[PDB]
Design a protein around this ligand. Structure first.
Ligand SMILES: CC[C@@H](C)[C@@H](NC(=O)[C@@H]1CCCCN1C)C(=O)N(C)[C@H](C[C@@H](OC(C)=O)c1nc(C(=O)N[C@@H](Cc2ccccc2)C[C@@H](C)C(=O)O)cs1)C(C)C
Ligand SMILES: Nc1nc2c(ncn2[C@@H]2O[C@H](COP(=O)(O)OP(=O)(O)O)[C@@H](O)[C@H]2O)c(=O)[nH]1
Ligand SMILES: [Mg+2]
Lengths: 67, 430
């Protein structure tokens, strides 16, 4: 009985520790995955816009290439 | 003489315990300071059973007060008798067990129990011939229930050859609406069946019906309930506290009352039933005491005695009266009802008379019965338990403290087996 009493409080502690650990883990994966998604979505928006600059030099070059 | 150590645990345990100390202190002419002021020496002969003798001619109850919360103990410290208890004998924690047996038995109760055990040890060591232990507590809360049964288990380990005795208050939905009380009670009963020698079942349902139906109290309080409890406790410990022949110590009591080790749960009874203050002008006759104390309406456990059989019965009459008449009236009760008494334990009713009546009465009688009808109380707890357990309702409060369901299935099984053992003996013939 006394060894069992010890296991029980041990199990309590363990399950509580494990609840915290899992929550920390799930929180951190969600944060970094949200950070990546948001970076990508902004990288792509800016490069689309960069491609507008390439195309606008290309339209002006083509103009001055007319004699 | 042979010393008894008293432990009271939790709100209920400490309320009924305090109340016991008040009552027997007055029966022995010991006043709140520890000073004797009575006029008989019957009062002092066996005082050492319950009181240590301090220098200055003072009596200190041999009593340990335990709870996981401070509440009821500030309250007892400042009761009428509060100043009587030894102060390092109050053992208390801070957070309370929230009506959770797992907390009482395994997690918070775990923390405090070594401090209790040290006080118990200290009280033991200074005893010439320790008879054993008695505990007051309820089964439906968390401290009295889960911690109190943890204590019993630890005391049994250090003192395997002393008698362990409890006064166990059984929960009822007439008194309490806390939903998990059948869980705490079933877990507790499981412990009690293994680790006690005698258990007096005080059933909250019985006390409430007595108060309502008979004492005509439309709104009973706990104080009303506890008044019936303390009369009873005084009654059942008479033989231990006064000179006499029958059941004069815990072990003699257990050998007269317990034919099989598991069936050690008793129905106490009492006459006359009274409410606090309100007045007792007419003494009962020996025939009235006798009919009343065996009345189902006088039992502190809500069982119907005609539904079972008495294995053994101890009866105690108090106040000055005719022993001859006690004797005819007792014989008359058994002869007129012989079929409620198992033929295979001959002469299973024992009777004591003590000359000193209880405060405010010229005479009373106390009954202690080991009846198979006590199965009814266990059946009621079991039905409440199973309705919840079959859906695992409210279990998360228990597993959140580390318990496993298995522990619940075992308690339930042990209790179902208890009930069927009583049934086996109700039907056994000779
Ligand atoms: C708000 C309603 C509760 C008061 C009440 N009702 C119920 O609990 C519900 C209500 C609806 C569903 C089914 N029933 C069970 C109740 O009467 N209860 C809990 C009492 C107990 C309760 O009653 C009253 C009227 O106060 C309490 N009694 C005391 C009490 O005795 N306190 C004494 C001190 C004391 C003693 C022991 C424990 C705590 C406090 C103080 C004095 C005046 C006395 O001795 O009578 C405190 S709470 C009985 C069923 C036993
Ligand atoms: N008869 C009686 N029953 C009580 C008293 N106090 C609490 N109870 C009952 O005991 C159960 C709760 O136990 P309690 O002792 O308060 O909890 P603990 O402090 O965790 O042991 C419920 O059934 C209550 O109705 C009391 O003073 N007298
Ligand atoms: Mg409490």
């Amino acid at each position: 009985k006394r060894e069992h009493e010890r296991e029980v409080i041990q199990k309590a502690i363990e399950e509580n520790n494990n609840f915290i650990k899992m929550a920390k883990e799930k929180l951190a994966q969600k944060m970094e995955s949200n950070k990546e998604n948001r970076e990508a979505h902004l990288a792509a928006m800016l490069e689309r816009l960069q491609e507008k600059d390439k195309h606008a030099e290309e339209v002006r070059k083509n103009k001055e290439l007319k004699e | 003489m042979r010393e008894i150590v008293h432990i009271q645990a939790g709100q209920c345990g400490n309320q009924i315990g305090a109340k016991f100390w008040e009552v027997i202190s007055d029966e022995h002419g010991i006043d709140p300071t520890g000073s004797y002021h009575g006029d008989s020496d019957l009062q002092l002969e066996r005082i050492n059973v319950y009181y240590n003798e301090a220098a200055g001619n003072k009596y200190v109850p041999r009593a340990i007060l335990v709870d996981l919360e401070p509440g009821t103990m500030d309250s007892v410290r400042s009761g009428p008798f509060g100043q009587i208890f030894r102060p390092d004998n109050f053992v208390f924690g801070q957070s309370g067990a929230g009506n959770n047996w797992a907390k009482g038995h395994y997690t918070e109760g775990a923390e405090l129990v070594d401090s209790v055990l040290d006080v118990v040890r200290k009280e033991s060591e200074s005893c010439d011939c320790l008879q054993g232990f008695q505990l007051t507590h309820s089964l439906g809360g968390g401290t009295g229930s889960g911690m109190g049964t943890l204590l019993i288990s630890k005391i049994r380990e250090e003192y395997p050859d002393r008698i362990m005795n409890t006064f166990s208050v059984v929960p009822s939905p007439k008194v309490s609406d806390t939903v998990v009380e059948p869980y705490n009670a079933t877990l507790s009963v499981h412990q009690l069946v293994e680790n006690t020698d005698e258990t007096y079942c005080i059933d909250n349902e019985a006390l409430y019906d007595i108060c309502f139906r008979t004492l005509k109290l439309t709104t009973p309080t706990y104080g009303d309930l506890n008044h019936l409890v303390s009369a009873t406790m005084s009654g059942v410990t008479t033989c231990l506290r006064f000179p006499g022949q029958l059941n004069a110590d815990l072990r003699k009591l257990a050998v007269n009352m317990v034919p099989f080790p598991r069936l050690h749960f008793f129905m106490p009874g009492f006459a006359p039933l009274t409410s606090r203050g309100s007045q007792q002008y007419r003494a009962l006759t020996v025939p009235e005491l006798t009919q009343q104390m065996f009345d189902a309406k006088n039992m502190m456990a809500a069982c119907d005695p005609r539904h079972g059989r008495y294995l053994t019965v101890a009866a105690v009459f108090r106040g000055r009266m005719s022993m001859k008449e006690v004797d005819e009236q007792m014989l008359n009760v058994q002869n007129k009802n012989s079929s409620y008494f198992v033929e295979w334990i001959p002469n299973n009713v024992k009777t004591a008379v003590c000359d000193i009546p209880p405060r405010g009465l010229k005479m009373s009688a106390t009954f202690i019965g080991n009846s198979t009808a006590i199965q009814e109380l266990f059946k009621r707890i079991s039905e409440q338990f199973t309705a919840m357990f079959r859906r695992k309702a409210f279990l998360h409060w228990y597993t959140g403290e580390g318990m496993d369901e298995m522990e619940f299935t075992e308690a339930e099984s042990n209790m179902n087996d208890l009930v069927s053992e009583y049934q086996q003996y109700q039907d056994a013939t000779a």
